[PDB]
Amino acid sequence: GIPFLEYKHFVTRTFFPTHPLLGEWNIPEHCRPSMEEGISLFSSLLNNKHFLIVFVHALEQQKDFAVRDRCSLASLLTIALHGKLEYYTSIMKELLVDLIDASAAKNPKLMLRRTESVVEKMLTNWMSICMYGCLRETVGEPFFLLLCAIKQQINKGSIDAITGKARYTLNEEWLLRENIEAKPRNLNVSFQDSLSVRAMDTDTLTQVKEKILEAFCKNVPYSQWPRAEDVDLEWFASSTQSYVLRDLDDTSVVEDGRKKLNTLAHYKIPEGASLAMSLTTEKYFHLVKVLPEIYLTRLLSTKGTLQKFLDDLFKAILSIREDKPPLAVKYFFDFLEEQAEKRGISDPDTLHIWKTNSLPLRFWVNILKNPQFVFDIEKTDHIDACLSVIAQAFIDACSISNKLLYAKEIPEYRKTVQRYYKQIQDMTPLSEQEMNAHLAEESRKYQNEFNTNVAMAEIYKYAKRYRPQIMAALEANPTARRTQLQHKFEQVVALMENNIYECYS
């Protein structure tokens, strides 16, 4: 089965560039009844929009509140408020209005292109939360198949162990620009039932150990696989002699001052040879304008193989499933369009840019470049290089105006994207009550998975760090002032600082 990550690990890897937020904090249990008091009070402040909005705006005014802090703050907020998604959303929307109003003297086409603010990161976390269903239901499967096809196609030819260059690839920079003879090899491998694994002559023994591990650990998530450097490989040449096969040993040869890694052909391993796997820089080499034709068609073959898989994926991402309409996407796109009308922005391009800078570029591009955010699978610099080419094509598909390989396909992708944004305009509008019932359901669903207490405590450190600034901000806000929020804020600080000393001291 497709090795999906649990929802918590998905959130963990996308929200933060964490184990603390998953398990209950092993803080002292004698001051714990006192701690829950301080966190409860602070929750009350956080759950009041007149505090939170002022709180965020105040932190962002600081010249020493770094970009990562604004992002760490945003994610902590998403986790803490995860049980109150409706309230979280409305906070985000107000904060988004403030962002748009602040950019009223700038080009509207530059909106939401980066993530240098608390709200921008909040948007990414909202999209992520709301698209996890899409992944599990429709997009996750073709994406995983594409990954499998990418890996399969590259393994057809040789791969350099050091440079990572191969015969097949989508990236012009990773082409094995050398012409080296390489014949396939089948190996009857054991693992203390015997199985058969295909490799190449030029494959190093690390690479072979890896290719073997993939066969024996097929129906197993990657985090449970042993490693190449953890296993040994043993050849059975005859009945009186066996040979442990390693990348480097006594048989290793030096050429031109450099030492070649031991290949499958270095030991001259025959076809169908019995092998046994068991548990236990720039000084060494392996295989070392206009692009020539002999390399060009190696790029074409790889693209041609995956083309079916790739089309399926983009279609999955850029189309509506009738069984389950994208309520969230529809809700935010209605918000963007409504926000544009109020300000005299009718230019179709800017709207297209807004939508694009909200969902496809915010969530999907990083998803295409980071499959580990979704699956418990392996990351290699080579597969990454192919994903970069693919993701760039997706990026180009979203625009309006090494980039030669997919040049023919992009115009059709653009029409799909335009056909996709039209679909969302064409689906029946969802009311606020309908969308909130959805957000309520999702909050109920994932209620006991995140440790909100740890999240609150981390947020508090920002509040403590800027204790006098928030106080001033709260008193400079007549609404916050009238409802005694600066008093309630100081009550939290006082109570928290008494509790933290009781625990750690």
Author numbering: 1345 to 1361, 1389 to 1563, 1568 to 1655, 1670 to 1677, 1697 to 1809, 1820 to 1923
From the paper:
GIPC1 (GAIP interacting protein, C-terminus 1) and its two paralogs GIPC2 and GIPC3 are universal adaptor proteins that bind and regulate vesicular trafficking of many transmembrane proteins. GIPCs contribute to the endocytosis process by tethering the cargo proteins on endocytic vesicles to the motor protein myosin VI. GIPCs contain a central PDZ (PSD-95, Dlg and ZO-1) domain that mediates the interaction with the C-terminal PDZ-binding motif (PBM) in cargo proteins. The transmembrane receptor PlexinD1 contains a C-terminal ‘SEA’ motif that constitutes a PBM and interacts with GIPC1.
